[PDB]
């Protein structure tokens, strides 16, 4: 009989049951979206969009709803922290429900096309065999894709008729859903310009409408129809996978590096923001200003918003995770609760020292303090017997500015040491570890999990492209090679051109 | 709620094992005819 890995091939000459399979697949995916959204609402804590945003909570689909303008629950909270808001029907709950209902309807349509598979529409009027005119279908579907794409860009993203998209400042402090005007200039290609997303979909959309019309109207040339076997549906599978894995790599790429469509308030920071101390720079620039206007240290660190300081913490770096360290980030370091304050370290000579930060490569890292110049001035030693730089020897102290600990100073070396061990991670926060029984080990964020899965699927889909590509172009020998194949075709020098028998002698 | 941790796997196998047994028997019945 058929081998197990071939069972679905019974659909190839059965357009009706192929539609049926395809409907059931759509039924399943829509059903997952609804299921996933409900599970996420059952477990999402909305009470703190500063220190407990969705991306700390292992929320995966919640940020794709938020991304295009769904921001509120029927229970009256919004992910922007507003209370007493009226989302109308298109809340997270209503979105979840529409997908379940859509799933159920597609399930019924699937049964109908499965049972009534023998529709006349699918038979070639000439010959009465099942036939599908795929060049025309492509043209139709392209036209439709073009309209949707144009319409999504022209009405939904502009706010002409729809809510716009998630947009934020450069430090993810003030994100929200806004209409976005298209950027028609060259910055439209700047992946960090949200306007370019709008312009992309207007223009590409029109291009699709035109291209779809051309493909509805103009037949493919003979040369191409033969070369690409356009009468064979596996050709479409092969190129379709190719476009899919191309697209899969692009969205993995843009999710790891960042873009206007992968904002840090819904997916977390990028690893590159830690690499370049992006948030540390902006924090410092603000402190330097405040001190220019002559505020005390306490006053100027007191003015740094907790949200900003939270971004300057390696526990939100998505490259700090582990493949089998499962769940939300809160299951690792804990549910963040408060900024403890910026810790300033000083040796006995009064001189300020800087803890050297953990780079993302390092599961563990020594505690090394340097001066403004980068000269080692204190450490926590491994072998003590010949240590020169110990905290005890160098009289290291720590003083906090801002945060829970503002104005406090600790001198006992044990305590100074523990704050110094946290300072390799960046800014120091108070964590609730009891509620989730957090184990203390960094997890990755949804930005990391998304990227891992899409990069991996893109690679596998490359294999399916090669597989179905080769079955299209070699269908004639799929079951084997010609049992009476001339040896003159494969021995050298019989034919002047390889494989062509008309070039004999 | 503080439910019994093994309730889940107890339930999953209580469904899975007998159901699978019937499915095996049905499918090999259908392919006799």
């Amino acid at each position: 009989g058929l081998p197990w890995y071939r069972v679905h091939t019974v659909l190839i000459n059965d357009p009706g049951r192929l539609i049926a399979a395809h409907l059931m697949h759509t039924a399943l995916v829509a059903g997952w979206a609804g299921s996933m959204a409900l599970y996420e609402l059952a477990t999402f804590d909305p009470s703190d969009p500063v220190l407990n945003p969705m991306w700390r909570q292992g929320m995966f689909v919640l940020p794709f709803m938020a991304r295009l303008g769904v921001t509120g629950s029927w229970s009256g909270w919004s992910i922007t922290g507003e209370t007493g808001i009226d989302p109308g029907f298109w809340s997270f709950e209503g979105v979840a429900l529409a997908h379940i209902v859509l799933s159920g309807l597609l399930f019924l349509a699937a049964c109908w096309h499965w049972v009534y598979w023998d529709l006349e529409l699918f038979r070639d009027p000439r010959t009465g065999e099942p036939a599908l005119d795929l060049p025309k279908m492509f043209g139709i579907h392209l036209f439709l894709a073009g309209l949707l794409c144009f319409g999504f860009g022209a009405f939904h993203l502009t706010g002409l008729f729809g809510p716009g998209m998630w947009v934020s400042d450069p430090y993810g402090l003030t994100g929200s859903v806004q209409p976005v005007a298209p950027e028609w200039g060259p910055d439209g290609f700047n992946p960090y310009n949200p306007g370019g997303v709008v312009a992309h979909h207007i223009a590409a959309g029109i291009v699709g409408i035109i291209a779809g019309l051309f493909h509805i109207l103009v037949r493919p040339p003979q040369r191409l129809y033969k070369a690409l076997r356009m009468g064979n549906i596996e050709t479409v599978l092969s190129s379709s996978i190719a476009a899919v894995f191309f697209a899969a790599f692009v969205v993995a790429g843009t999710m790891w590096y960042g873009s206007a469509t992968t904002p840090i308030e819904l997916f977390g920071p990028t690893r590159y923001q830690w690499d370049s101390s992006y948030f540390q720079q902006e924090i410092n620039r603000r402190v330097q200003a405040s001190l220019a206007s002559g505020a005390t240290l306490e006053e100027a660190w007191s003015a740094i918003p907790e949200k900003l300081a939270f971004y300057d913490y390696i526990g939100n770096n998505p490259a700090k995770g582990g493949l089998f360290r499962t769940g939300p980030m809160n299951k690792g370091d804990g549910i963040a609760q408060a900024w403890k304050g910026h810790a300033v370290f000083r040796n006995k000579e009064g001189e300020e020292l800087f803890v050297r930060r953990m780079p993302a490569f390092f599961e563990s890292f020594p505690v090394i303090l340097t001066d403004k110049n980068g000269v080692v001035k204190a450490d926590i030693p491994f072998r003590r017997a010949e240590s020169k730089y110990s905290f005890e020897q160098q009289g290291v102290t720590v003083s906090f500015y801002g945060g829970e600990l503002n104005g406090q100073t600790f001198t006992d070396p044990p305590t100074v040491k523990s704050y110094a061990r946290k300072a390799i991670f960046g800014e120091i926060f108070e964590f609730d570890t009891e509620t989730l029984n957090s184990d203390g080990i960094f997890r990755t964020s949804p930005r990391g999990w998304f990227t891992f899965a899409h990069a991996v699927f893109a690679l596998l889909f490359f294999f399916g492209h090669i597989w179905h590509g080769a079955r299209t172009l070699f269908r004639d020998v799929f079951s084997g090679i010609d049992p009476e194949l001339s040896p003159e075709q494969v021995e050298w020098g019989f034919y002047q051109k390889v494989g062509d028998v008309t070039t004999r002698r | 709620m503080e439910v019994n941790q093994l309730g889940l796997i107890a339930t999953a196998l209580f469904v899975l094992v007998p159901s699978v047994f019937l499915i095996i028997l049905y499918v090999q019945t259908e392919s006799q005819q």
Binding site: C111 | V3, G7, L8, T11
Partner: peptide, 30 residues
Amino acid sequence: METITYVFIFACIIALFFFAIFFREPPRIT
């Protein structure tokens, strides 16, 4: 986890009703 289990079992029973009604062994006279 208990909630998902109860709703899962309930939902399987509904699916089963659908199959038992519409994809039954048709009764045939003799």
